[PDB]
Motif scaffolding. Sequence first.
Motif, mmCIF file in Angstrom:
data_model
loop_
_atom_site.group_PDB
_atom_site.id
_atom_site.type_symbol
_atom_site.label_atom_id
_atom_site.label_comp_id
_atom_site.label_asym_id
_atom_site.label_seq_id
_atom_site.Cartn_x
_atom_site.Cartn_y
_atom_site.Cartn_z
ATOM 1 N N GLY A 7 2.115 6.303 -6.792
ATOM 2 C CA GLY A 7 2.057 5.902 -8.186
ATOM 3 C C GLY A 7 1.349 6.858 -9.122
ATOM 4 O O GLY A 7 0.976 6.476 -10.236
ATOM 5 N N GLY A 20 4.242 6.799 1.346
ATOM 6 C CA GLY A 20 3.843 6.286 0.049
ATOM 7 C C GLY A 20 4.744 6.653 -1.109
ATOM 8 O O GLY A 20 4.405 6.349 -2.257
ATOM 9 N N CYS A 21 5.877 7.297 -0.849
ATOM 10 C CA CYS A 21 6.816 7.700 -1.885
ATOM 11 C C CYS A 21 8.022 6.766 -1.945
ATOM 12 O O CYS A 21 8.354 6.070 -0.982
ATOM 13 C CB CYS A 21 7.301 9.132 -1.636
ATOM 14 S SG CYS A 21 6.011 10.406 -1.545
ATOM 15 N N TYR A 22 8.670 6.756 -3.109
ATOM 16 C CA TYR A 22 9.922 6.042 -3.319
ATOM 17 C C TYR A 22 10.709 6.808 -4.375
ATOM 18 O O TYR A 22 10.140 7.551 -5.180
ATOM 19 C CB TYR A 22 9.713 4.567 -3.704
ATOM 20 C CG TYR A 22 9.347 4.301 -5.146
ATOM 21 C CD1 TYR A 22 8.029 4.383 -5.576
ATOM 22 C CD2 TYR A 22 10.319 3.954 -6.075
ATOM 23 C CE1 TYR A 22 7.690 4.123 -6.892
ATOM 24 C CE2 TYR A 22 9.990 3.700 -7.395
ATOM 25 C CZ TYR A 22 8.674 3.785 -7.798
ATOM 26 O OH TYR A 22 8.345 3.542 -9.113
ATOM 27 N N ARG B 117 1.635 -1.684 -3.661
ATOM 28 C CA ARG B 117 1.468 -0.317 -3.182
ATOM 29 C C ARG B 117 1.717 0.737 -4.252
ATOM 30 O O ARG B 117 0.936 1.686 -4.381
ATOM 31 C CB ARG B 117 2.398 -0.032 -2.004
ATOM 32 C CG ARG B 117 2.315 1.425 -1.564
ATOM 33 C CD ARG B 117 2.470 1.580 -0.080
ATOM 34 N NE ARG B 117 3.701 0.955 0.378
ATOM 35 C CZ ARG B 117 3.747 0.033 1.328
ATOM 36 N NH1 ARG B 117 2.649 -0.385 1.935
ATOM 37 N NH2 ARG B 117 4.920 -0.498 1.661
ATOM 38 N N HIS B 118 2.787 0.585 -5.031
ATOM 39 C CA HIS B 118 3.192 1.579 -6.016
ATOM 40 C C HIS B 118 2.666 1.299 -7.418
ATOM 41 O O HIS B 118 3.345 1.603 -8.406
ATOM 42 C CB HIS B 118 4.711 1.738 -6.003
ATOM 43 C CG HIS B 118 5.233 2.245 -4.694
ATOM 44 N ND1 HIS B 118 5.966 1.467 -3.824
ATOM 45 C CD2 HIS B 118 5.091 3.451 -4.092
ATOM 46 C CE1 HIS B 118 6.269 2.177 -2.752
ATOM 47 N NE2 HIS B 118 5.750 3.384 -2.889
ATOM 48 N N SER B 119 1.490 0.685 -7.525
ATOM 49 C CA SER B 119 0.876 0.523 -8.832
ATOM 50 C C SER B 119 0.588 1.911 -9.393
ATOM 51 O O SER B 119 0.169 2.815 -8.666
ATOM 52 C CB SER B 119 -0.411 -0.297 -8.728
ATOM 53 O OG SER B 119 -1.361 0.343 -7.892
ATOM 54 N N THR B 120 0.818 2.085 -10.688
ATOM 55 C CA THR B 120 0.631 3.391 -11.300
ATOM 56 C C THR B 120 -0.836 3.705 -11.560
ATOM 57 O O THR B 120 -1.647 2.827 -11.865
ATOM 58 C CB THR B 120 1.400 3.498 -12.617
ATOM 59 O OG1 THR B 120 1.084 2.380 -13.457
ATOM 60 C CG2 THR B 120 2.898 3.557 -12.363
ATOM 61 N N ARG B 121 -1.163 4.988 -11.422
ATOM 62 C CA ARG B 121 -2.475 5.542 -11.745
ATOM 63 C C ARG B 121 -2.172 6.824 -12.517
ATOM 64 O O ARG B 121 -2.112 7.912 -11.939
ATOM 65 C CB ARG B 121 -3.322 5.788 -10.499
ATOM 66 C CG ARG B 121 -4.741 6.204 -10.828
ATOM 67 C CD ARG B 121 -5.611 6.391 -9.601
ATOM 68 N NE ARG B 121 -5.286 7.560 -8.798
ATOM 69 C CZ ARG B 121 -5.243 7.559 -7.472
ATOM 70 N NH1 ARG B 121 -5.437 6.451 -6.775
ATOM 71 N NH2 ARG B 121 -4.998 8.697 -6.832
ATOM 72 N N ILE B 122 -1.983 6.687 -13.830
ATOM 73 C CA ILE B 122 -1.582 7.789 -14.697
ATOM 74 C C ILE B 122 -2.739 8.162 -15.613
ATOM 75 O O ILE B 122 -3.459 7.291 -16.116
ATOM 76 C CB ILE B 122 -0.330 7.438 -15.527
ATOM 77 C CG1 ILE B 122 0.648 6.581 -14.721
ATOM 78 C CG2 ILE B 122 0.361 8.705 -15.990
ATOM 79 C CD1 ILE B 122 1.241 7.290 -13.526
ATOM 80 N N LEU B 237 1.073 12.913 -12.454
ATOM 81 C CA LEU B 237 1.648 12.269 -13.625
ATOM 82 C C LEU B 237 0.623 12.139 -14.744
ATOM 83 O O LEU B 237 -0.557 11.870 -14.502
ATOM 84 C CB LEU B 237 2.196 10.891 -13.251
ATOM 85 C CG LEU B 237 3.414 10.901 -12.327
ATOM 86 C CD1 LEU B 237 3.750 9.489 -11.877
ATOM 87 C CD2 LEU B 237 4.597 11.525 -13.039
#
Lengths: 33, 252
Positions: A7, A20-22, B117-122, B237
């Motif tokens: 993320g 951990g990638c998508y 899991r894929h929560s953003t950290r920008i 990012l």
Amino acid sequence: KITICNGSTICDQRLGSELGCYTINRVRSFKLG
Amino acid sequence: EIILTLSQGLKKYYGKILRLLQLTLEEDTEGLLEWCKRNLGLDCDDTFFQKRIEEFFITGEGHFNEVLQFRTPGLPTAEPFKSYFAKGFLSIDSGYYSAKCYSGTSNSGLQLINITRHSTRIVDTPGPKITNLKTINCINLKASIFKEHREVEINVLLPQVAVNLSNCHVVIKSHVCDYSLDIDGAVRLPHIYHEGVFIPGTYKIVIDKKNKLNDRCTLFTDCVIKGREVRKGCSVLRQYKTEIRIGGGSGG
Ligand SMILES: *[C@@H]1O[C@H](CO)[C@@H](O)[C@H](O)[C@H]1NC(C)=O
Ligand SMILES: *[C@@H]1O[C@H](CO)[C@@H](O)[C@H](O)[C@H]1NC(C)=O
Ligand SMILES: *[C@@H]1O[C@H](CO)[C@@H](O)[C@H](O)[C@H]1NC(C)=O
Ligand SMILES: *[C@H]1O[C@H](CO)[C@H](O)[C@H](O)[C@H]1NC(C)=O
């Protein structure tokens, strides 16, 4: 084709399959309705 | 005490699902529990509704009925919803609100992202506070202007990053649910709980510019951009807050 990892990073095609990638794919095609 | 009919309780059953999906902040579930006992023969507890949602969107196998139950493939009958469908959608319509939701069996692959899991950290970064619709260049936003459809489409590629409506009447389209939004603030997305929080991996904001209520429609969002190289073939990012006017323009 865009790959987002943990993320917080964007990776190219090679590491698209890493942990951990998508991936987000742009779809361009024709289909039967 | 008041008894609900089949159609009355089904709308309340869909209002429960719309609420648990976090598409609505309000519900009318008065009489739903008795309706579930009288028509489904079970206690439609919050655990039961999570399973219905979890199955219908992710793990459901086989055909599904109007109440999100799954089954592997004359005289009057008391038990309703015995007609199942192999794949497709349900019009989850409570009367007050509705959403066209697609079954998970109707997609070639899972179209929900595990934001646990894929929560953003920008990282915030300098950038224009105002962005022109014709010149959007963001990793999370892809904009198409269809003058023949009289429409503007905003493809949102990072649903984890909020897109905030301001005086807009839009239709959200995705591989999960399609619904209309007309309220200011962040775009609501369907939330599925399955050992973590799941939301659509991508979605589309469809804005009818023929509708005069969209004449001042504006989006507030972060424009995600690629930064410096940190690892082999990967870049961190970055994002900057920006305002995108959609409703304006010229005629003729
Ligand atoms: C994501 O984080 C995990 C845990 O630190 C790490 O093993 C992995 O390499 C990271 N992924 C990338 C693409 O850097
Ligand atoms: C969703 O992500 C969380 C956090 O990484 C993980 O514990 C969980 O197992 C994931 N859920 C599924 C269904 O893969
Ligand atoms: C959009 O609203 C959310 C609140 O839901 C807020 O966190 C976010 O910063 C807003 N985005 C912008 C670009 O102002
Ligand atoms: C009862 O079940 C049968 C299944 O054969 C039909 O679906 C019928 O329409 C049902 N009737 C009611 C009132 O639910």
